[PDB]
Amino acid sequence: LTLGNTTSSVILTNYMDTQYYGEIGIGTPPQTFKVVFDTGSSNVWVPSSKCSRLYTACVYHKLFDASDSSSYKHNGTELTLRYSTGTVSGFLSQDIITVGGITVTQMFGEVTEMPALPFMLAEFDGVVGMGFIEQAIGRVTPIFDNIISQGVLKEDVFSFYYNRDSENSQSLGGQIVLGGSDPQHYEGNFHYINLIKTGVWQIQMKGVSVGSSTLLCEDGCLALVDTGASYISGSTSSIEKLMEALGAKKRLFDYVVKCNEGPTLPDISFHLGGKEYTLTSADYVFQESYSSKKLCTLAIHAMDIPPPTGPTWALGATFIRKFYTEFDRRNNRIGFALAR
Numbered sequence: 145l146t147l148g149n150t151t152s153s154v155i156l157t158n159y160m161d162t163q164y165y166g167e168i169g170i171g172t173p174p175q176t177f178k179v180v181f182d183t184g185s186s187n188v189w190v191p192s193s194k195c196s197r198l199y200t201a202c203v204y205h206k207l208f209d210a211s212d213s214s215s216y217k218h219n220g221t222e223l224t225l226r227y228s229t230g231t232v233s234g235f236l237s238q239d240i241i242t243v244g245g246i247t248v249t250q251m252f253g254e255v256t257e258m259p260a261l262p263f264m265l266a267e268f269d270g271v272v273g274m275g276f277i278e279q280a281i282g283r284v285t286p287i288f289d290n291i292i293s294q295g296v297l298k299e300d301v302f303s304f305y306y307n308r309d310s311e312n313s314q315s316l317g318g319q320i321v322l323g324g325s326d327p328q329h330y331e332g333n334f335h336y337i338n339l340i341k342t343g344v345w346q347i348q349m350k351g352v353s354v355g356s357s358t359l360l361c362e363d364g365c366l367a368l369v370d371t372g373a374s375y376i377s378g379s380t381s382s383i384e385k386l387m388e389a390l391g392a393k394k395r396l397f398d399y400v401v402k403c404n405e406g407p408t409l410p411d412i413s414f415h416l417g418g419k420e421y422t423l424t425s426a427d428y429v430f431q432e433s434y435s436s437k438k439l440c441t442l443a444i445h446a447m448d449i450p451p452p453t454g455p456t457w458a459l460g461a462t463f464i465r466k467f468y469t470e471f472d473r474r475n476n477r478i479g480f481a482l483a484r
């Protein structure tokens with residue numbers, strides 16, 4: 145492992161506190177794409193020009209055209225990525241990718257089949273897997289690894305900062321520091337937890353308390369810190385007990401509560417090996433109103449993840465927003481600190 149003396153930041157755009165994306169450039173000349181930096185997976189992909197326009201999601205997002213890249217290197221082996229919430233398919237390709245000033249020859253997925261749900265709701269075009277190689281589908285080297293190979297980054301780590309306020313222009317959407325963290329965005333000290341197993345940014349969780357009565361994950365469980373996730377997710381089982389306590393009505397894809405109830409929901413705590421991470425009503429409630437006549441939605445939906453990774457809670461944006469996260473690849477641990 146060769147460490148240099150370079151740090152790289154990627155500015156992120158925040159769309160409704162549900163989508164955080166930055167921009168990368170694939171090919172020569174560069175073709176810019178809006179992508180999500182996802183610690184939940186390890187593959188890089190963007191919609192391809194070779195994608196049937198019968199997929200409206202491809203008609204609504206920027207496509208990569210290898211024919212216009214002089215650095216494109218063909219490979220073409222089939223590729224299918226199955227996420228807990230969707231699936232994309234296409235073939236492998238290689239080209240130079242630019243991210244935060246860094247330029248690395250990456251091997252990405254050229255998606256030719258992207259279904260409306262969910263990507264038709266995506267404000268971005270693709271995904272950049274920030275997970276380990278063990279999870280990389282097709283055994284393709286993840287992009288952070290290739291960059292770590294350049295022996296330029298000061299540290300074999302990368303941090304995420306998701307801003308609370310979304311739209312307001314003036315404010316910084318979000319930020320990712322490649323090779324370390326940005327102390328200007330957190331306070332107090334970091335606190336780490338070791339990864340249960342490597343290859344996956346998943347840590348052990350001692351319990352989940354709703355208010356005063358730790359009525360969840362009493363026998364401990366797993367929390368996967370998914371930066372490419374909007375909410376905090378748990379097994380349908382867990383979320384039912386959780387929602388019963390908040391008195392939330394179970395709608396099709398999320399839970400709600402009469403907007404006036406919001407300010408009265410108790411604090412929710414996650415005991416992540418060492419400290420107790422607490423969220424308050426405002427931290428997980430979309431208080432877009434205060435009347436009994438309207439519905440407010442919670443930023444904690446239920447979602448079951450297939451083994452060998454699941455079942456598991458996934459701590460996404462809802463959580464990150466309050467706690468600046470550091471992903472340490474060298475000591476295989478995640479550091480948490482109070483984002484400011």
Ligand SMILES: COCCCOc1ccccc1N1CCN(C[C@H](N)[C@@H](O)C[C@H](C(=O)NCC(C)(C)C(N)=O)C(C)C)CC1=O
Nearest residue numbers: 162163164184185227228229262263265266279372373374
């Ligand atoms: C900050 O951005 C907020 C997220 C916004 O979400 C969206 C909005 C509209 C359309 C797409 C999405 N995304 C983002 C990417 N994502 C990826 C997802 N995070 C996966 O990484 C989850 C992960 C998984 O299934 N891995 C894939 C598999 C199974 C191939 C692997 N590497 O293990 C689990 C384990 C949490 C799924 C997803 O909806």
Ligand SMILES: *[C@@H]1O[C@H](CO)[C@@H](O)[C@H](O)[C@H]1NC(C)=O
Nearest residue numbers: 217218219220221236251283
């Ligand atoms: C694609 O990449 C793999 C991985 O090294 C390689 O073995 C394969 O031959 C490539 N596909 C071709 C032949 O373009």
